[PDB]
Design a binder for this molecule. Structure first.
Ligand SMILES: [Mg+2]
Ligand SMILES: [Zn+2]
Ligand SMILES: [Zn+2]
Lengths: 113, 32, 39, 263, 133, 147, 67, 506, 137, 62, 49
RNA sequence: GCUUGUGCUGUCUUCGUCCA
């Protein structure tokens, strides 16, 4: 009766932006990123990738409520680096890691086929 | 023949690399 | 009646399982009671 | 830097070991394979006649759970993203089932082999219900006696397991790391001795047990992950793994594009 | 820089209820009547009975949000094997020369008994303890 | 079957549930606090016996006042490669990391009761009133009011 | 009522193994051995076939309402 | 039935559920109930634009409206209006808009025994069909989520809304006038997890600390320095808990005359909102007086005290989610070394009762003044058997390790007590019906399986076994008799107590 | 057969093992040392037959606190199952039928005569006891 | 007088493509259609409907 | 059913007596007003004809 | 130009649900 539609977990409304960024003025060089229609799958990947960068001093995320499909991430880098550049570097690095993983799996599967 | 007809010493050769009273074998018609 | 094949198979399985249970459970109980007696 | 080593390979399950990756990446890959790889499943049932003892929506639910071959589902489009009025051949696959019992005695079984593909995308290997062999009758759908008939027309669409569990390609993904607990990520409940009260992991022989005089290593991180991917037959194991990787890449690329277009 | 420095010999090590925490009791070699009761993390700095520990107390590590230390910077902690940071919650100005300082490193407790002259400078809000072995 | 009634609090998908090393996710998670105050040890014994029975393909005999003991069931469970007390090392769904505490885990017989929320939810702004007193009628079926 | 298509817990397809399971039980195999021969390892899957009660064989005994 | 209490409009009723992610004074309202109920808002020049938007949205789209009421009192129904977009709102009209977020609503559970059973929450519209409560408010309502239902009443005026938000609001009701102590505290697995998280040997890595700090809504964006800086940065659970406590809070407690060095990690000392030592448990964050909640309420006010619940719950729930906690059959089992002690104690008590029986049968028994020989004999036997059960339970409890889950739940105070451990592990004990041992229902015996005139402990309702060990048929029947007495006593005393309270109120 | 008044004058044995004269898990039988010797006249067929229809469903009812047994006896009459096999041809005011009934894995011997194996009213769920996310308190 | 009221309709676009329903409310440009597939009623624009007629499906020109 | 009703209630009729052994169920009884007054026959009981 | 459809008893009884 009051159950929401299941496609609302991943289908993005037109008026809702996928990615909203607002600065966090309490500490220097910090931003708050709000991801819509995402969950732990992308969030944990990004967080653990960014935690290893020497120029990222704080990274965290939280899912406010399990019944709503979104999460909010806090990122805070050194003085030299803008946080959004660090986020882009994390995305590209994980993409390269996945690409080489796929290549190696294909090689191994062909060998053992 | 079956396991019972095997010689006791040959039964001793069957070592896993006894029934218990509380494990029944399932049924479908029950009784009554 | 002309019972279906699955029902006939289930009846045969039930008869076999009833016989096997009546044998094995009784044997296990007889094995346990004598041990409890001699203790 | 990442490495993959395959232990066992089959059409339906692959057992592999990942190494030199973070735990988060392996877990995200597992989650993606479980609930974000698109497959093909029956999503609409039009019941033209159903005189069997099962309810109409009972049979509809049973039909939705039948796995269909989804090899070329990438070429296929989502139903909501197709501009065609109603459903075309490029966003849906139409299957039809017709079962009847003849004679006044006996019972007829309706299997998933009776599902006949009527229309679908041209030359795409999608839609056919999965069969173990050429002589496998398939999933039991219903039973009929004399003068009972089942005549339905089903439409299969593309979706992911987030929307409904019937679109999940995997059954259960075994996942495991650190068999010998060198990282002390878990603390073992025990009564007398924790070592002899806990069964050994099935991969315990793949890693050297810690030495008796060894000290705890606080600099170590989980490095080798053992995972087994089982599928329902709609997709092969290698296809599931590769498509999970590709889906994760697409998601990250979408995030990157959003960031770059935000400015 | 450093507010206190001495060398202690461990008399007793008590594991007790816990697995990762040990109570150690030590007396200064150069000066008796100085006692040290301390909680330590076993898995990171394991100790044994009759060990010799160099204990130093400082009010700063130099030579507000915490950040992971860059490999390029150098601080006082580079010379020691175990550094903790805590708050002083009691400075017992006791008898003629009996002074007790209670310090809590996030729940891991330390008590330092000694004369007034040695522990006069330890009247600070927060203290670092630096242990070498 | 032991007086442990409850209602569904939330539903998690397959990939959000905790899982064991062999990929088994629970259908249902109940709080540990239900056990100690109510002392339904039969719940735990039934879970253990059902685990052993489903592993070995038998049906457990839970007749009261028999000679069955927990130690016999534990020996049987240990012989099959599981922890004798029923615990299992379980991983976190969100991050994949091991849980520090092992989880009691096994099949148990649950039954669905007739009381469903959609047969009890009721709201009223305005509607029919009684003829004698001109106050809201009584009953959810009649769009009545609350007392 | 009739054997479920998928295992509730994990999702393995067990709906195509009911007839084979009955055939194996007919030949005298034990229930555990029959379930092992069908490659049902996880006990979550084993409970699906082990504890299924086939009620459709009782519903089919009623005369059909149409002809 | 019609004047002192009557049925009312603008109300709802449905099953309640728990939500760890709700503030203390928030209630989760289904969308259908929010659409059905309404609040008449007067059109002014501060909200005419928003109210026109609501009127356009109609009675089926949230946010929406159901009626528009003119000055003369005529109601315009928006379901049956074909020209809803052709309606212009004039100042002074009323729009019966849908229920929206942060609307104060009165919330109630029956029976309403005291004034904390009706409190005003703030609405938050949520999917699915159950009311949702923060679990700290389940204590004043005496509610749990096994099927309970609660009532919601919507105020219909500005005056009534102000009264609800300024008088009956949940934060204002934390401290009760009945015993000048808080009525809400940390409960259930949050209590268990704050005990486990604040143990002396709980250390947290940097990456988990960052997540735990981001979860605190009131965190100021400064990460505390770790307790251990080298070789590896580690934080203790006490630090992460002190993050949730507002600054300027001082709390000191002495448990069992502990010293300031706290060898057993008991007692408590909070200095400027930072925990120095002491495990946090029921004695600190419970509903008792003089705890952390009472101190915060007296010091900072109801708003900060309400935020404290949310902060603590969020941190502890995240930590416990990523740590885990369970209970199994292995937690009710004691080793053979303790079982032989329990058996010896029970046998010694039975021998003592036998000796007392012999002494009474040979007129050698001392008589308690004011009681007959039979009464004195029965009292002595009952005291001996109760001491036997207590001794066996104490042995079992002392056996238990620190990793025992039942012991952890009892120590935290979240659920259970010593008697539960004693009965599950050691001995159920003596069953009493109407304050006496099991009577002689048959002819001079309790059951037809005993000989006549048998006063042995097992013949009059002493359950020697434990729940883990299992009860024999006779013990089963006696225990069933005692349980039936308990059920009857509850179901009978409830009506008498209700009548007494009604007379007192009148 | 004996009624409630004839039972006053008979001596019953609980089990056939009672007719003749150090484990931490097995239960303890009554010592019954007050009588030098016993002359039983009857023996109970099986002690678990003192339970009713609804209480014969509980597994291990002797390991439970008795109020929980009473609550289960009450709640077992509200469990949806298959009340009859001819539910299609019946016109009842209400009817609830479970899609996939399963028989219990841990059953009792008294369930054989209650037909609980053929018309079961529940399912075997994989249950985990844990404080996962705080939503099951 | 809203000739498409109480008429079987099919949805051709959006998240409910190809679902049969019956029109219940016809105020204007926003039609309330109950779905046969689940037990719910949804709003939908007129452009998204295919009204059944005597000869197949017809777009919103009925 | 025991037709003692609600007026003039007492605890003794509602109790589980020793003589109930083997003839009525010790565990099965309703809640609230009819607790103890409504009884269920044991599984081997009979009624004389 | 053919124009859209607003209304519900009552009194007993029983059986249940959540507290008690
Ligand atoms: Mg309740
Ligand atoms: Zn198309
Ligand atoms: Zn399975």
């Amino acid at each position: 009766m009051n159950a929401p539609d299941r496609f609302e977990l991943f289908i993005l409304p037109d008026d809702v932006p996928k990615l909203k960024i607002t600065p966090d003025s309490r500490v220097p060089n910090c931003i708050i990123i709000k991801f819509e229609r995402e969950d732990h799958t992308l969030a944990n990947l990004l967080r653990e990738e960014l935690a290893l960068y020497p120029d990222v001093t704080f990274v965290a995320y939280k899912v406010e409520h399990p019944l709503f499909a979104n999460f909010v991430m806090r990122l805070q880098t050194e003085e030299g680096t803008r946080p959004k550049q660090a986020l882009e570097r994390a995305c590209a690095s994980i993409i390269n890691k996945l690409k080489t993983l796929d290549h190696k799996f294909n090689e191994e599967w062909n060998i053992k086929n | 023949l079956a396991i019972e007809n095997l010689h006791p010493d040959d039964r001793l050769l069957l070592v896993d690399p006894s029934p218990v009273f509380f494990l029944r074998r399932p049924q479908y018609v029950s009784d009554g | 009646v002309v019972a279906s094949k699955a029902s006939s198979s289930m009846l045969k399985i039930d008869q076999r399982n009833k016989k096997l249970n009546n044998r094995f459970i009784r044997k296990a109980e007889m094995a346990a009671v004598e041990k409890r007696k001699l203790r | 830097e990442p490495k993959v080593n395959i232990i066992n390979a089959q059409d339906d399950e692959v057992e592999l070991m990942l190494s030199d990756v973070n735990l988060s990446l392996a877990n995200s890959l597992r989650r993606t394979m479980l609930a974000e790889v698109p497959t093909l499943a029956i999503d609409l049932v039009e019941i033209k006649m159903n005189t069997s003892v099962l309810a109409d929506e009972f049979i509809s639910h049973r039909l939705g759970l039948i796995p269909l071959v989804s090899e070329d589902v990438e070429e296929m489009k989502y139903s909501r993203d197709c501009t065609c009025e109603d459903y075309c051949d490029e966003c849906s696959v139409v299957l039809e089932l017709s079962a009847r019992h003849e004679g006044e005695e006996g019972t007829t079984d309706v299997y998933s082999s009776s599902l006949i593909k009527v229309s679908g995308p041209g030359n795409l290997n999608v839609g056919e219900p999965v069969r173990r062999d050429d002589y496998d009758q398939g999933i039991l759908l219903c039973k009929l006696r004399n003068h009972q008939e089942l005549n339905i027309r089903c439409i299969a669409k593309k979706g992911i397991a987030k929307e409904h569990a019937k679109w999940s390609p995997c059954s259960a993904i075994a996942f495991e790391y650190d068999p010998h607990n060198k990282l002390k990520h878990t603390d073992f409940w025990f009564e007398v001795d924790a070592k002899k009260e806990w069964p050994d992991s099935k991969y315990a022989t793949w890693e050297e047990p810690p030495k008796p005089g060894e000290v705890f290593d606080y600099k170590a991180k989980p490095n080798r992950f053992y995972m087994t991917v089982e599928t329902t037959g709609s997709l092969k194991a290698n296809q599931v793994f590769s498509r999970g990787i590709k889906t994760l890449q697409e998601k990250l690329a979408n995030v990157l594009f959003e960031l770059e277009n935000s400015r | 820089s450093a507010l206190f420095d001495d060398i202690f010999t461990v008399q007793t090590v008590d594991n007790g209820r816990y697995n990762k925490v040990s109570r150690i009791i030590g007396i200064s070699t150069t000066n008796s009547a100085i006692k040290l009761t301390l909680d330590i993390n076993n898995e990171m700095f394991p100790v044994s009975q009759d060990d010799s520990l160099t204990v130093t107390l400082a009010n700063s590590l130099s030579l507000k949000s915490w950040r992971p230390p860059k490999p390029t910077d150098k601080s006082l902690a580079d010379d020691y094997d175990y550094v903790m940071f805590g708050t002083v919650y009691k400075f017992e100005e006791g008898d003629e020369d009996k002074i007790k300082v209670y310090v809590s490193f996030g729940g891991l407790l330390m008590c330092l008994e000694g004369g007034y002259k040695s522990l006069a400078s330890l009247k600070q809000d927060n203290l670092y303890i630096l242990i070498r072995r | 079957r032991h007086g442990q009634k409850g209602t569904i609090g939330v539903t998690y998908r397959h990939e959000d549930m905790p899982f064991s090393a062999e990929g088994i996710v629970p259908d249902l998670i109940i709080n540990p606090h239900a056990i100690p105050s109510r002392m339904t040890v039969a719940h735990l014994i039934e879970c253990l016996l059902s685990k052993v029975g489903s592993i070995r393909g038998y049906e457990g005999d839970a007749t009261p006042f028999t000679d069955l003991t927990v130690d016999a069931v534990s020996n049987l469970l240990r012989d099959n490669g599981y922890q004798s007390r029923g615990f299992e090392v379980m991983y976190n769904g969100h991050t994949g990391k091991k849980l520090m505490a092992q989880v009691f885990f096994g099949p148990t017989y649950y039954q669905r009761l007739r009381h469903m929320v959609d047969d009890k939810i009721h709201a009223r702004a305005r509607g029919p009133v009684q003829v004698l007193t001109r106050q809201p009628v009584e009953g959810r079926s009649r769009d009545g009011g609350l007392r | 009522m009739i054997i479920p298509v998928r295992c509730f817990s994990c999702g393995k397809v067990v709906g195509d193994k009911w007839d084979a399971y009955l055939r194996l039980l007919e030949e005298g195999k034990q229930e555990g051995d029959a379930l092992d021969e069908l490659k049902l390892k996880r006990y979550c899957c084993r409970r699906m076939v082990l504890t299924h009660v086939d009620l459709i064989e009782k519903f089919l005994r009623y005369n059909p309402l149409e002809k | 039935g019609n004047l002192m209490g009557k049925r009312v409009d603008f109300s709802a009723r449905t099953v309640i559920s728990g939500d760890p992610n709700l503030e203390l004074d928030q209630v989760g309202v289904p969308i259908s109930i929010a659409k059905t109920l309404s609040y008449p808002e007067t059109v002014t020049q501060y909200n005419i634009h928003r109210l026109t938007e609501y009127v356009r949205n109609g009675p089926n789209e949230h946010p929406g409206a159901k009626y528009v009421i003119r000055d003369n009192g005529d109601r315009i129904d928006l379901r049956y209006h074909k020209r809803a977009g052709d309606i212009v709102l004039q100042y002074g009209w009323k729009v019966e808009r849908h229920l929206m977020d942060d609307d104060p609503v009165l919330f109630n559970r029956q029976p309403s025994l005291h004034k904390m059973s009706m409190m005003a929450h703030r609405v938050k519209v949520m999917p699915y069909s159950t009311f949702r409560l923060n679990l700290s408010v389940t204590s004043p309502y005496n509610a749990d989520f096994d099927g309970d239902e609660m009532n919601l009443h919507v105020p219909q005026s500005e005056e009534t809304r102000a009264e609800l938000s300024q008088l009956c609001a949940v934060p204002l009701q934390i401290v009760s006038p009945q015993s000048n102590k808080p009525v809400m505290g940390i409960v259930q697995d949050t209590l268990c997890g704050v005990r486990k998280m604040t143990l002396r040997d709980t250390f947290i890595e940097y990456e988990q600390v960052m997540n735990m700090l981001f979860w605190v809504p009131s965190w100021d964006g400064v990460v505390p320095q770790p307790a251990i800086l080298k070789p590896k940065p580690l934080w203790t659970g006490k630090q992460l808990l002190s993050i949730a406590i507002p600054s300027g809070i001082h709390l000191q407690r002495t448990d069992g005359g502990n010293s300031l060095l706290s060898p057993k990690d008991n007692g408590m000392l909070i200095v400027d909102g930072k925990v120095m030592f002491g495990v946090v448990d029921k004695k600190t964050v419970g509903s008792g007086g003089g705890g952390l909640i009472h101190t915060v309420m007296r010091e900072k006010g109801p708003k900060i005290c309400a935020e404290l619940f949310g902060n603590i719950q969020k941190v502890v729930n995240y930590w416990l989610l990523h740590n885990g906690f369970s209970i199994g059959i292995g937690d009710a089992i004691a080793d053979a070394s303790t079982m032989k002690e329990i058996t010896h104690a029970i046998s010694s008590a039975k021998e003592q009762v036998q000796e007392i029986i012999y002494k009474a049968q040979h007129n050698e028994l001392e008589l308690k003044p004011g009681m007959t020989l039979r009464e004195s004999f029965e009292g002595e036997v009952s005291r001996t058997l109760n001491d036997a059960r207590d001794s066996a339970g104490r042995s079992a409890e002392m056996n238990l390790k620190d990793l025992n889950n039942v012991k952890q739940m009892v120590s935290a105070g979240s659920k259970g007590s010593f008697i539960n451990i004693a009965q599950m592990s050691a001995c159920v004990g003596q069953q009493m019906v109407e304050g006496k041992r099991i009577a002689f229902g048959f002819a001079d015996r309790s059951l037809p399986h005993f000989t006549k005139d048998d006063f042995s402990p097992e013949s009059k309702g002493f359950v020697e076994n434990s729940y883990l060990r299992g009860l024999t048929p006779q013990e089963f029947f006696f225990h069933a008799m005692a349980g039936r007495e308990g059920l009857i006593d509850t179901a009978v005393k409830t009506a008498e107590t209700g009548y007494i309270q009604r007379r007192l109120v009148k | 057969y004996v009624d409630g008044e004839e039972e006053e004058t008979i001596m019953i044995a609980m089990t056939p093992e009672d007719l003749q004269t150090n484990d931490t898990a097995k239960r303890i039988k009554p010592e019954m040392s007050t009588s030098s010797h016993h002359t039983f006249t009857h023996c109970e067929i099986h002690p678990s037959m003192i339970l009713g229809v609804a209480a014969s469903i509980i597994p291990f009812p002797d390991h439970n606190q008795s109020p929980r047994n009473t609550y289960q006896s009450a709640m077992g009459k509200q469990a949806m199952g298959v009340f009859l096999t001819n539910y299609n041809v019946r016109m009842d005011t209400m009817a609830n039928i479970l899609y996939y009934p399963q028989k219990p894995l841990a059953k009792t011997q008294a369930m054989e005569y209650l037909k609980f194996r053929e018309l079961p009213a529940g399912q075997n769920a994989i249950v985990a006891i844990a404080c996962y996310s705080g939503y099951n308190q | 007088r809203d000739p498409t009221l109480n008429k079987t309709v099919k949805i051709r676009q959006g998240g409910y493509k190809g679902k049969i329903g019956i029109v219940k409310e016809a105020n204007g440009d926003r039609f309330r259609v109950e779905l046969h597939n689940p037990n719910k009623t949804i709003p939908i624009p007129c452009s998204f409907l295919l009204i059944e007629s005597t000869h197949g499906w017809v777009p919103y020109e009925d | 059913n025991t037709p003692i009703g609600r007026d003039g209630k007492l605890a003794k009729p509602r109790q589980l007596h020793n003589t109930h052994w083997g003839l009525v169920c010790p565990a099965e009884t309703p809640e609230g007003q009819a607790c103890g007054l409504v009884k269920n026959l044991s599984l081997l009981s009979g009624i004389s004809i």
